[PDB]
Design a protein around this nucleic acid. Structure first.
Ligand SMILES: [Mg+2]
Ligand SMILES: [Mg+2]
Ligand SMILES: [Mg+2]
Ligand SMILES: [Mg+2]
Ligand SMILES: [Mg+2]
Ligand SMILES: [Mg+2]
Ligand SMILES: [Mg+2]
Ligand SMILES: [Mg+2]
Ligand SMILES: [Mg+2]
Ligand SMILES: [Mg+2]
Ligand SMILES: [Mg+2]
Ligand SMILES: [Mg+2]
Ligand SMILES: [Mg+2]
Ligand SMILES: [Mg+2]
Ligand SMILES: [Mg+2]
Ligand SMILES: [Mg+2]
Ligand SMILES: [Mg+2]
Ligand SMILES: [Mg+2]
Ligand SMILES: [Mg+2]
Ligand SMILES: [Mg+2]
Ligand SMILES: [Mg+2]
Ligand SMILES: [Mg+2]
Ligand SMILES: [Mg+2]
Ligand SMILES: [Mg+2]
Ligand SMILES: [Mg+2]
Ligand SMILES: [Mg+2]
Ligand SMILES: [Mg+2]
Ligand SMILES: [Mg+2]
Ligand SMILES: [Mg+2]
Ligand SMILES: [Mg+2]
Ligand SMILES: [Mg+2]
Ligand SMILES: [Mg+2]
Ligand SMILES: [Mg+2]
Ligand SMILES: [Mg+2]
Ligand SMILES: [Mg+2]
Ligand SMILES: [Mg+2]
Ligand SMILES: [Mg+2]
Ligand SMILES: [Mg+2]
Ligand SMILES: [Mg+2]
Ligand SMILES: [Mg+2]
Ligand SMILES: [Mg+2]
Ligand SMILES: [Mg+2]
Ligand SMILES: [Mg+2]
Ligand SMILES: [Mg+2]
Ligand SMILES: [Mg+2]
Ligand SMILES: [Mg+2]
Ligand SMILES: [Mg+2]
Ligand SMILES: [Mg+2]
Ligand SMILES: [Mg+2]
Ligand SMILES: [Mg+2]
Ligand SMILES: [Mg+2]
Ligand SMILES: [Mg+2]
Ligand SMILES: [Mg+2]
Ligand SMILES: [Mg+2]
Ligand SMILES: [Mg+2]
Ligand SMILES: [Mg+2]
Ligand SMILES: [Mg+2]
Ligand SMILES: [Mg+2]
Ligand SMILES: [Mg+2]
Ligand SMILES: [Mg+2]
Ligand SMILES: [Mg+2]
Ligand SMILES: [Mg+2]
Ligand SMILES: [Mg+2]
Ligand SMILES: [Mg+2]
Ligand SMILES: [Mg+2]
Ligand SMILES: [Mg+2]
Ligand SMILES: [Mg+2]
Ligand SMILES: [Mg+2]
Ligand SMILES: [Mg+2]
Ligand SMILES: [Mg+2]
Ligand SMILES: [Mg+2]
Ligand SMILES: [Mg+2]
Ligand SMILES: [Mg+2]
Ligand SMILES: [Mg+2]
Ligand SMILES: [Mg+2]
Ligand SMILES: [Mg+2]
Ligand SMILES: [Mg+2]
Ligand SMILES: [Mg+2]
Ligand SMILES: [Mg+2]
Ligand SMILES: [Mg+2]
Ligand SMILES: [Mg+2]
Ligand SMILES: [Mg+2]
Ligand SMILES: [Mg+2]
Ligand SMILES: [Mg+2]
Ligand SMILES: [Mg+2]
Ligand SMILES: [Mg+2]
Ligand SMILES: [Mg+2]
Ligand SMILES: [Mg+2]
Ligand SMILES: [Mg+2]
Ligand SMILES: [Mg+2]
Ligand SMILES: [Mg+2]
Ligand SMILES: [Mg+2]
Ligand SMILES: [Mg+2]
Ligand SMILES: [Mg+2]
Ligand SMILES: [Mg+2]
Ligand SMILES: [Mg+2]
Ligand SMILES: [Mg+2]
Ligand SMILES: [Mg+2]
Ligand SMILES: [Mg+2]
Ligand SMILES: [Mg+2]
Ligand SMILES: [Mg+2]
Ligand SMILES: [Mg+2]
Ligand SMILES: [Mg+2]
Ligand SMILES: [Mg+2]
Ligand SMILES: [Mg+2]
Ligand SMILES: [Mg+2]
Ligand SMILES: [Mg+2]
Ligand SMILES: [Mg+2]
Ligand SMILES: [Mg+2]
Ligand SMILES: [Mg+2]
Ligand SMILES: [Mg+2]
Ligand SMILES: [Mg+2]
Ligand SMILES: [Mg+2]
Ligand SMILES: [Mg+2]
Ligand SMILES: [Mg+2]
Ligand SMILES: [Mg+2]
Ligand SMILES: [Mg+2]
Ligand SMILES: [Mg+2]
Ligand SMILES: [Mg+2]
Ligand SMILES: [Mg+2]
Ligand SMILES: [Mg+2]
Ligand SMILES: [Mg+2]
Ligand SMILES: [Mg+2]
Ligand SMILES: [Mg+2]
Ligand SMILES: [Mg+2]
Ligand SMILES: [Mg+2]
Ligand SMILES: [Mg+2]
Ligand SMILES: [Mg+2]
Ligand SMILES: [Mg+2]
Ligand SMILES: [Mg+2]
Ligand SMILES: [Mg+2]
Ligand SMILES: [Mg+2]
Ligand SMILES: [Mg+2]
Ligand SMILES: [Mg+2]
Ligand SMILES: [Mg+2]
Ligand SMILES: [Mg+2]
Ligand SMILES: [Mg+2]
Ligand SMILES: [Mg+2]
Ligand SMILES: [Mg+2]
Ligand SMILES: [Mg+2]
Ligand SMILES: [Mg+2]
Ligand SMILES: [Mg+2]
Ligand SMILES: [Mg+2]
Ligand SMILES: [Mg+2]
Ligand SMILES: [Mg+2]
Ligand SMILES: [Mg+2]
Ligand SMILES: [Mg+2]
Ligand SMILES: [Mg+2]
Ligand SMILES: [Mg+2]
Ligand SMILES: [Mg+2]
Ligand SMILES: [Mg+2]
Ligand SMILES: [Mg+2]
Ligand SMILES: [Mg+2]
Ligand SMILES: [Mg+2]
Ligand SMILES: [Mg+2]
Ligand SMILES: [Mg+2]
Ligand SMILES: [Mg+2]
Ligand SMILES: [Mg+2]
Ligand SMILES: [Mg+2]
Ligand SMILES: [Mg+2]
Ligand SMILES: [Mg+2]
Ligand SMILES: [Mg+2]
Ligand SMILES: [Mg+2]
Ligand SMILES: [Mg+2]
Ligand SMILES: [Mg+2]
Ligand SMILES: [Mg+2]
Ligand SMILES: [Mg+2]
Ligand SMILES: [Mg+2]
Ligand SMILES: [Mg+2]
Ligand SMILES: [Mg+2]
Ligand SMILES: [Mg+2]
Ligand SMILES: [Mg+2]
Ligand SMILES: [Mg+2]
Ligand SMILES: [Mg+2]
Ligand SMILES: [Mg+2]
Ligand SMILES: [Mg+2]
Ligand SMILES: [Mg+2]
Ligand SMILES: [Mg+2]
Ligand SMILES: [Mg+2]
Ligand SMILES: [Mg+2]
Ligand SMILES: [Mg+2]
Ligand SMILES: [Mg+2]
Ligand SMILES: [Mg+2]
Ligand SMILES: [Mg+2]
Ligand SMILES: [Mg+2]
Ligand SMILES: [Mg+2]
Ligand SMILES: [Mg+2]
Ligand SMILES: [Mg+2]
Ligand SMILES: [Mg+2]
Ligand SMILES: [Mg+2]
Ligand SMILES: [Mg+2]
Ligand SMILES: [Mg+2]
Ligand SMILES: [Mg+2]
Ligand SMILES: [Mg+2]
Ligand SMILES: [Mg+2]
Ligand SMILES: [Mg+2]
Ligand SMILES: [Mg+2]
Ligand SMILES: [Mg+2]
Ligand SMILES: [Mg+2]
Ligand SMILES: [Mg+2]
Ligand SMILES: [Mg+2]
Ligand SMILES: [Mg+2]
Ligand SMILES: [Mg+2]
Ligand SMILES: [Mg+2]
Ligand SMILES: [Mg+2]
Ligand SMILES: [Mg+2]
Ligand SMILES: [Mg+2]
Ligand SMILES: [Mg+2]
Ligand SMILES: [Mg+2]
Ligand SMILES: [Mg+2]
Ligand SMILES: [Mg+2]
Lengths: 137, 52, 204, 117, 122
RNA sequence: GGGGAGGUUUGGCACCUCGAUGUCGGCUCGUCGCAUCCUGGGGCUGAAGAAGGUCCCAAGGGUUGGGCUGUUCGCCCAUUAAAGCGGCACGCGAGCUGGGUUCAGAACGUCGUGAGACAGUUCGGUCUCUAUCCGCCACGGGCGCAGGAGGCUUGAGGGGGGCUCUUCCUAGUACGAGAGGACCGGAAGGGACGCACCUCUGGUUUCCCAGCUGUCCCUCCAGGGGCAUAAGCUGGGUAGCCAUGUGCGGAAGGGAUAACCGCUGAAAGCAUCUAAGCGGGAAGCCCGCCCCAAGAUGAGGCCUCCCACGGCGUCAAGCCGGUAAGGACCCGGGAAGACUACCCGGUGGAUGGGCCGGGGGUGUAAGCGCCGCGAGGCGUUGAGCCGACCGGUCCCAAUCGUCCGAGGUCU
RNA sequence: ACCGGAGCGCUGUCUCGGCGAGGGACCCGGUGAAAUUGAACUGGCCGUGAAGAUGCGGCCUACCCGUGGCAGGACGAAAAGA
RNA sequence: GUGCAAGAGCACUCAGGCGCGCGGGAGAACCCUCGCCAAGGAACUCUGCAAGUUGGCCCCGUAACUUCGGGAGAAGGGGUGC
RNA sequence: CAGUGGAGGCCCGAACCGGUGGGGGAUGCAAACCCCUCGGAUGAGCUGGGGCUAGGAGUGAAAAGCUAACCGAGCCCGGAGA
RNA sequence: GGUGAAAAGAACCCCGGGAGGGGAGUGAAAUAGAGCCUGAAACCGUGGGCUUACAAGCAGUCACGGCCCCGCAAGGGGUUGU
């Protein structure tokens, strides 16, 4: 009994593992399963991650973007059965945990305020190609 | 004064009755092991002391 | 009519097919039946389930005399489940197949001495145009010379919370016998670690 | 009902913080200190932190502890004497024993605080 | 969540730029309206010689909100503004081409026409 | 033309109150009436159907948001199942407001020689911290419950809840020339309200982290502290408490009935629902659901535990000390709490504090190296710091002890 | 800093309330008032009575004493009605 | 004294003087004073009462009307640190 | 027209003089106070000291305002035991 | 306004920081002990008797009963259960 959490934590097996690490201040592209009419598709969604609300399992993250003149944000359960995959697209300088502030900034300022984390990229592409070697041979 | 005020002098009966729960109770005491005197449990007291 | 004692372990949410579901986890540990109410001896029918392992320390009480006549490991708690007589042994989560619905009972969180606005969810006066000393007050409480008194059970501020609260028709979302666990539809009275009894619903 | 949380106080924040400090200074200056019970039970944990933080040695720790006790000579005594004494120990660097005398003219109960030994 | 006295962006060439909510046509006394909810409203301003004139009392349906819509799949979604599409009394949209995204709740509600002309459902 | 009921209007009378019973409207909180606005059940219809009309039964719940005016009232906008009418000092100012009325200022029209005056108008104009008793909401102390104690309970008697729409299948079927369009039965989705909850969404989170200005100080640099609230400002923020968020409720069903519809059926050879007798029939009644509840002085029931006197009272019941089961004190505490109460723990112990780990928050600390003239930048680095949450560990603190507590009446 | 109408900006004025801070309230120790007060052993309903009853009648209800709260009554207090 | 356009303003601080002659705890309702708040933005109300919004200096720019002075800080913008 | 010049019951704003709106206070810190807000601030300005005018009399940018904490006729003593 | 005939106004010892007491002492009397003759009532307190925690009240009166106390007795006093 003296593990009230670990018990409630046992129900965690609905947990993912495939998904790649990413943190606010860099843009991604989730592929969500959706019910159109009655069937099932795979709608993409690509924008900057503005918030990650950590809480072990059932942690969440929210991405925003501009669709046809209007802004739009979506909240995704991190370990959701509907996220087929989540291709990251570009890393960038955080400097802050929650970046709501870009809401009032959607313009040239964003691009210049969130440069590009050459560090988290230099490790991305490095351990990408450099790690491809070990698996192939 | 302003607005409410007693409608009648309280009787010496009712008065003392109210006070039925005012009485005190003696302090809880125990004979301290070291000395002979009394101490309030869980406390150190003069003319005595403690072990380490 | 089933029955079983447990603790509110906490709650989170799991996914049923392509839909998320909020669930409260209840540990309905194995309950050693302790006595039996019968029409002949007691005047009614029921079963006194025990629950949770007691150290023979606090059992200094002649409770041991009750546990002896049943040959049971001393428990920390025990309440009856009315009109439910299981075979002589022990009840467990096994009686709850998923999709069944249950009536859960628990002692709500204690909101202490609560104002009328929190307790009875009154309206209270204006934050603004005058008054400024009755913002959270209940205002009038009566009439005039007639009836010239206040109604019995009038809504007024006071202690509120930490009372016997029974929710109903909660869905048994799952059941993990390997852990005496029991998943529900989330909203169950009381705080975590709180004792809580789960019964069969009265929908049907 | 507030309090479902966990902490205690009187006075306002900047004062209460100043209180814990000015006590822990005297306490790390006299080794024995007498205050009111509640003030003591609270001071208790505040010191077991600088003391343990004192078991570590790096200048970062020193600089951290300076933020509370302003006196440099005092942090010396803490690092170069008080701390070593508590090597090979893990917590409970401090002790609180309630006295049997109340304060007169306000009837407040007292208790002793001391660097353990 | 839209309620009377609220302003809405008009997402179609009906001529109207902005309309204010008059009444949310859910229950007999509903507090608020949301995506896929219809509302009576006043045209608080419109473009010259539009089908709808400034001052008309129109019906419209919420296509976007600022308060995130919570979906059963555990996700949610919110837009930068509150928007609507003026509709015919038989509930078909009055204007044609509708601009900007839309919540798919519009679909389950029976606004096929509008999700169609929508340049992007989300 | 005629007879009544009611006591919401306007009056009549002048009966309590002029050593004072504060007047309208609004707000808050309601509760009651039924002469019913809606929903439920019926009769008739000039009821094809859908929809109405009229009367009957029925308070159980419901009875929206705005524009104008101090308004009540009323008009209007947009909805609705409906936007019911009255009582309660036209309910409620020791609950609030004070726009209106109803003091002194001032002005208009009007009257008056005048001072002034107006159910005429206009702008302004001090609303009193402390509840004794009854009542009401909560929470304890005492004693009782004819042995004492631990735990579990029965439910007399109360209380809460009680609403309604919409689309779809039945079926474009019965009905109708057409337009339109059912009963009965079944399904889905809502509005408002109520209870509980923090997973999610979304708030607060007063020192959890970070950044920034001015100044003063430590210690010159660097680093850091105070004050700029009772957080100096700002960007974020766990637990807890919360709704905008999540779950669940209104029932089902049983029983007796209202209007009403009937069977059998006389009195009264026919006829009659009725006089004997019986069946059906409401959102209403009684149960059922949830909550309180044996001070139910009619003080209940079950399981279990401890039992003789140890001294005076011969008669009467008691009375005084030591103890049994068991309880209390004191201490560490708590999603329990104003206090008390309630609950857990007290060295055979993880109750609090510290330390450790995890969760979580902030978002690369200090120091050093490197690049730049420099403000800075880069690396070491998801670093450093790090409340409340989930656990672990006897380092510190619950040390030692004290007090009360049956001897069980009689027929 | 006159009085009326409208609009933009902004907002807890409001839908509709929630959380947080501090000073009181609450508990302990010290000091310790006031208006008021015929006397009190001071319940509910329906009547009744000088026409609005804790005190009369009938009936219902109710173990003794307090503490924190609410303001319907005591035709509450105050001021020999302006 | 330092800073801010200036100043006897504001913030911190010299010299100097004080913590206001009841304290201790608790962390209910409720009152006062203060901070914040999803969506909405006057729907509040007799009345935007209240509170918020705006705020300093520099630069661009500024309408009807006018008694030619005004209206003007109109309005609306941009800059501000190292 | 430029320059110089520095006028004003001019402008912003402390001291200072006020008392606009709201809140608190109501046996008050206070027999008129506290907080936020607001008005004037070279003038019909504010202010220290020395003086004069008073009871049907004074003074009054006029409210019957003020004339020692209540002025449609001050206070005290007397007529007076009206 | 008042000790007492007279200060004979309480040496000395004891508890106490003091105040104030307890003894000793003076006096006819100290409950005449110093704002001290007499010392009423309201009001506060200590002890004793009767009485009260299912009870409805202008508080009393009438009756009976119980307990306690006075007198050998018939009797009387206090209290109060119905
Ligand atoms: Mg665990
Ligand atoms: Mg737990
Ligand atoms: Mg409010
Ligand atoms: Mg007022
Ligand atoms: Mg007031
Ligand atoms: Mg009455
Ligand atoms: Mg009454
Ligand atoms: Mg937990
Ligand atoms: Mg805690
Ligand atoms: Mg501060
Ligand atoms: Mg710590
Ligand atoms: Mg007649
Ligand atoms: Mg009448
Ligand atoms: Mg009349
Ligand atoms: Mg009369
Ligand atoms: Mg007459
Ligand atoms: Mg009177
Ligand atoms: Mg009166
Ligand atoms: Mg009135
Ligand atoms: Mg009124
Ligand atoms: Mg009908
Ligand atoms: Mg029909
Ligand atoms: Mg027809
Ligand atoms: Mg016809
Ligand atoms: Mg027809
Ligand atoms: Mg039909
Ligand atoms: Mg009839
Ligand atoms: Mg009727
Ligand atoms: Mg209306
Ligand atoms: Mg209409
Ligand atoms: Mg309708
Ligand atoms: Mg209609
Ligand atoms: Mg209607
Ligand atoms: Mg009527
Ligand atoms: Mg009414
Ligand atoms: Mg009235
Ligand atoms: Mg009337
Ligand atoms: Mg009235
Ligand atoms: Mg009032
Ligand atoms: Mg009123
Ligand atoms: Mg009053
Ligand atoms: Mg006013
Ligand atoms: Mg009004
Ligand atoms: Mg007016
Ligand atoms: Mg008037
Ligand atoms: Mg008058
Ligand atoms: Mg006048
Ligand atoms: Mg008139
Ligand atoms: Mg007026
Ligand atoms: Mg007041
Ligand atoms: Mg009374
Ligand atoms: Mg009463
Ligand atoms: Mg019952
Ligand atoms: Mg009932
Ligand atoms: Mg009922
Ligand atoms: Mg009801
Ligand atoms: Mg059909
Ligand atoms: Mg069809
Ligand atoms: Mg079909
Ligand atoms: Mg046919
Ligand atoms: Mg026809
Ligand atoms: Mg036909
Ligand atoms: Mg045909
Ligand atoms: Mg046909
Ligand atoms: Mg034909
Ligand atoms: Mg047809
Ligand atoms: Mg058709
Ligand atoms: Mg929850
Ligand atoms: Mg939080
Ligand atoms: Mg800190
Ligand atoms: Mg944090
Ligand atoms: Mg430096
Ligand atoms: Mg600094
Ligand atoms: Mg300060
Ligand atoms: Mg500020
Ligand atoms: Mg500030
Ligand atoms: Mg700071
Ligand atoms: Mg902050
Ligand atoms: Mg039924
Ligand atoms: Mg049944
Ligand atoms: Mg009937
Ligand atoms: Mg027949
Ligand atoms: Mg019959
Ligand atoms: Mg019959
Ligand atoms: Mg039947
Ligand atoms: Mg029924
Ligand atoms: Mg129903
Ligand atoms: Mg029955
Ligand atoms: Mg029955
Ligand atoms: Mg209970
Ligand atoms: Mg119960
Ligand atoms: Mg009992
Ligand atoms: Mg019971
Ligand atoms: Mg019993
Ligand atoms: Mg038994
Ligand atoms: Mg024996
Ligand atoms: Mg024997
Ligand atoms: Mg112990
Ligand atoms: Mg052990
Ligand atoms: Mg521990
Ligand atoms: Mg621990
Ligand atoms: Mg950690
Ligand atoms: Mg983390
Ligand atoms: Mg770095
Ligand atoms: Mg290097
Ligand atoms: Mg270099
Ligand atoms: Mg260099
Ligand atoms: Mg790592
Ligand atoms: Mg903290
Ligand atoms: Mg560990
Ligand atoms: Mg004993
Ligand atoms: Mg004994
Ligand atoms: Mg006995
Ligand atoms: Mg003016
Ligand atoms: Mg506006
Ligand atoms: Mg804001
Ligand atoms: Mg309101
Ligand atoms: Mg507080
Ligand atoms: Mg006070
Ligand atoms: Mg104070
Ligand atoms: Mg006190
Ligand atoms: Mg009573
Ligand atoms: Mg009657
Ligand atoms: Mg009478
Ligand atoms: Mg009489
Ligand atoms: Mg009376
Ligand atoms: Mg009589
Ligand atoms: Mg009576
Ligand atoms: Mg009663
Ligand atoms: Mg008290
Ligand atoms: Mg109170
Ligand atoms: Mg009252
Ligand atoms: Mg009050
Ligand atoms: Mg009254
Ligand atoms: Mg008079
Ligand atoms: Mg500056
Ligand atoms: Mg400046
Ligand atoms: Mg500058
Ligand atoms: Mg001085
Ligand atoms: Mg003071
Ligand atoms: Mg002092
Ligand atoms: Mg702030
Ligand atoms: Mg703000
Ligand atoms: Mg807001
Ligand atoms: Mg905001
Ligand atoms: Mg916002
Ligand atoms: Mg706006
Ligand atoms: Mg308005
Ligand atoms: Mg309104
Ligand atoms: Mg209004
Ligand atoms: Mg108006
Ligand atoms: Mg304002
Ligand atoms: Mg405000
Ligand atoms: Mg503010
Ligand atoms: Mg601002
Ligand atoms: Mg600016
Ligand atoms: Mg600003
Ligand atoms: Mg001019
Ligand atoms: Mg400007
Ligand atoms: Mg202008
Ligand atoms: Mg401007
Ligand atoms: Mg600007
Ligand atoms: Mg800088
Ligand atoms: Mg020129
Ligand atoms: Mg020049
Ligand atoms: Mg000049
Ligand atoms: Mg010049
Ligand atoms: Mg001037
Ligand atoms: Mg001016
Ligand atoms: Mg002046
Ligand atoms: Mg003013
Ligand atoms: Mg003022
Ligand atoms: Mg004014
Ligand atoms: Mg006021
Ligand atoms: Mg005022
Ligand atoms: Mg006041
Ligand atoms: Mg005061
Ligand atoms: Mg202002
Ligand atoms: Mg000024
Ligand atoms: Mg000025
Ligand atoms: Mg002068
Ligand atoms: Mg002079
Ligand atoms: Mg002179
Ligand atoms: Mg005169
Ligand atoms: Mg003058
Ligand atoms: Mg005088
Ligand atoms: Mg005169
Ligand atoms: Mg005289
Ligand atoms: Mg006379
Ligand atoms: Mg004469
Ligand atoms: Mg003498
Ligand atoms: Mg002596
Ligand atoms: Mg001395
Ligand atoms: Mg002496
Ligand atoms: Mg003597
Ligand atoms: Mg003698
Ligand atoms: Mg004699
Ligand atoms: Mg003598
Ligand atoms: Mg004598
Ligand atoms: Mg004498
Ligand atoms: Mg004397
Ligand atoms: Mg005397
Ligand atoms: Mg004599
Ligand atoms: Mg006497
Ligand atoms: Mg006595
Ligand atoms: Mg007795
Ligand atoms: Mg009695
Ligand atoms: Mg009676
Ligand atoms: Mg005796
Ligand atoms: Mg005798
Ligand atoms: Mg008697």
């Amino acid at each position: 009994m003296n593990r009230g959490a670990l018990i409630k934590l046992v129900e965690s097996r609905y947990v993912r593992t495939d998904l790649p690490e990413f943190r606010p201040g860099d843009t991604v592209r989730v592929s969500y399963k959706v019910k159109e009419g009655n069937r099932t598709r795979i709608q993409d969604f690509e924008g900057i991650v503005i918030r990650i609300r950590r809480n072990g399992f059932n942690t969440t993250f929210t991405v925003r973007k501009v669709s046809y003149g209007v802004g739009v944000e979506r909240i995704f359960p991190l370990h959701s059965p509907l996220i087929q995959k989540i291709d990251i697209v570009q890393r960038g300088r955080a400097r802050r945990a929650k970046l709501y502030f870009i809401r009032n900034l959607s313009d040239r300022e964003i691009r210049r305020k969130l440069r590009a984390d050459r560090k988290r990229i230099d490790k991305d592409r490095a351990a990408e190609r450099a790690a491809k070697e070990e698996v192939q041979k | 004064a302003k607005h409410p005020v007693p409608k009648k002098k309280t009787s010496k009966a009712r008065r003392d009755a109210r006070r039925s729960h005012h009485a005190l109770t003696p302090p809880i005491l125990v004979p301290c092991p070291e000395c002979k005197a009394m101490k309030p449990p869980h406390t150190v007291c003069p003319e005595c002391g403690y072990y380490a | 009519m089933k029955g079983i004692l447990g603790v509110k372990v906490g709650m989170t949410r799991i996914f049923r097919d392509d839909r998320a579901v909020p669930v409260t986890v209840i540990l309905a540990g194995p309950c050693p039946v302790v006595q039996r109410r019968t029409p002949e001896k007691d005047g009614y029918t029921a079963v006194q389930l025990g629950f949770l392992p007691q150290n023979p320390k606090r059992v200094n009480r002649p409770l041991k005399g009750h546990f002896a006549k049943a040959g049971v490991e001393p428990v920390r708690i025990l309440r009856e489940i009315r009109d439910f007589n299981p075979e002589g042994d022990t009840v467990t989560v096994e009686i709850f197949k998923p999709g069944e619905r249950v009536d859960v009972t628990g002692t709500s969180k204690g909101r202490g001495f609560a104002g009328v606005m929190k307790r009875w969810n009154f309206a209270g006066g204006p934050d603004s145009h005058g008054a400024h000393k009755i913002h959270r007050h209940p205002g009038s409480i009566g009439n005039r010379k007639t009836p010239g008194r206040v109604y019995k059970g009038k809504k007024m501020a006071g202690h509120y919370g930490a009372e016997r609260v029974t929710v109903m028709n909660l869905e048994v979302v799952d059941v993990i016998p390997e852990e005496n666990l029991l998943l529900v539809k989330g909203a169950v009275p009381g705080p975590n670690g709180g004792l809580v009894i789960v019964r069969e619903t009265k929908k049907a | 009902r507030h309090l479902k949380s966990g902490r205690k106080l009187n006075r306002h924040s900047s004062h209460r913080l100043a209180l814990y400090r000015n006590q822990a200074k005297s306490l790390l200056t006299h080794g024995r200190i007498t205050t009111t019970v509640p003030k003591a039970k609270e001071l208790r944990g505040f010191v077991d932190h600088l003391i343990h933080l004192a078991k570590r040695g790096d200048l970062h720790a020193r600089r951290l502890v300076l933020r509370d006790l302003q006196d440099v000579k005092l942090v010396r005594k803490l690092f170069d004497e008080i701390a070593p004494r508590y090597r090979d120990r893990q917590g409970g660097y401090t002790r609180v024993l309630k006295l049997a005398e109340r304060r007169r003219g306000d009837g407040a109960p007292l208790a002793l605080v001391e660097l353990v030994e | 969540m839209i309620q009377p006295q609220t302003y809405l962006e008009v997402a179609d060439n009906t001529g109207a730029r902005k309309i204010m909510c008059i009444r949310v046509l859910k229950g007999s006394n509903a507090k608020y309206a949301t995506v896929g909810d219809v509302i009576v409203a006043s045209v608080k301003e419109a473009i010259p010689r539009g089908a709808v004139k400034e001052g008309d009392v129109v019906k419209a349906v919420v296509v976007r909100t600022k308060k995130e819509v919570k979906r059963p799949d555990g996700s949610a979604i919110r837009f930068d503004d509150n928007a609507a599409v003026i509709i015919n009394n038989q509930l078909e949209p009055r204007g044609t081409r509708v601009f900007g995204p839309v919540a798919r709740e519009l679909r389950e509600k029976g606004f096929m026409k509008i999700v169609s002309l929508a340049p992007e459902v989300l």
